[PDB]
Design a protein around this ligand. Structure first.
Ligand SMILES: C[C@@H](C(=O)O)[C@H](NC(=O)c1ncnc2[nH]ccc12)c1ccccc1
Length: 167
């Protein structure tokens, strides 16, 4: 049993809600919140900008030290950093950005990072401003993640479209 409320059950392990991931994190304080990061951990907009703003820029400060020490992530890769005031940990996951010309086949690899954590609050990777088909991303999520994932979809029209088209 956990604290996530009002999520629609899609499969044995995947649940979905039309919600702002920042507000969900502030309410539940999950062990892991997933950020839709880029390889440089530059948290400018989207999920990343919103999470970072909610941490008063502490996420960015921590991320800059991470990159200075370790260099950029891989597309499809991840790192575990602090969740600051929002969660115990933040799993920064890099899905491919189609608007940058990156390979959508890497989306499965990106979702595989979720399997290292028993429960996660997460966004829909590579969708929205990352340019990929959101129906496809949800399919890859359900067909790749085996641990318990609570998906928070910001856009209301998108949420309705995803639910109504889900197989
Ligand atoms: C799909 C899309 C959505 O769920 O609509 C999602 N975006 C957000 O979650 C979002 N965007 C901008 N400002 C925000 N503030 C609070 C949340 C939030 C998203 C997922 C992966 C990559 C980029 C974007």
């Amino acid at each position: 049993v956990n604290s996530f409320s009002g999520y629609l059950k899609l499969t044995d392990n995947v649940y979905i809600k039309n919600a702002d991931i920042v507000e969900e994190a502030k309410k539940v304080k999950p062990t892991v919140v997933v950020n839709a990061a880029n390889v440089y951990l530059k948290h400018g907009g989207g999920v990343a900008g919103a999470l970072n703003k909610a941490t008063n820029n502490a996420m960015q400060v921590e991320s800059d030290d991470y990159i200075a020490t370790n260099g950029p992530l891989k597309v499809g890769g991840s790192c575990v950093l602090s969740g600051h005031n929002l969660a115990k940990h933040c799993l920064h996951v890099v899905g491919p950005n189609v608007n940058k010309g990156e390979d959508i086949q890497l989306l499965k690899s990106a979702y595989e990072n979720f399997n290292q954590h028993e429960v996660l609050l997460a966004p829909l990777l590579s969708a929205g401003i990352f340019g990929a088909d959101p129906i496809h991303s949800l399919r890859v999520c359900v067909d790749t993640v085996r641990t318990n994932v609570y998906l928070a979809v910001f856009d209301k029209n998108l949420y309705d479209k995803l639910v109504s088209s889900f197989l």
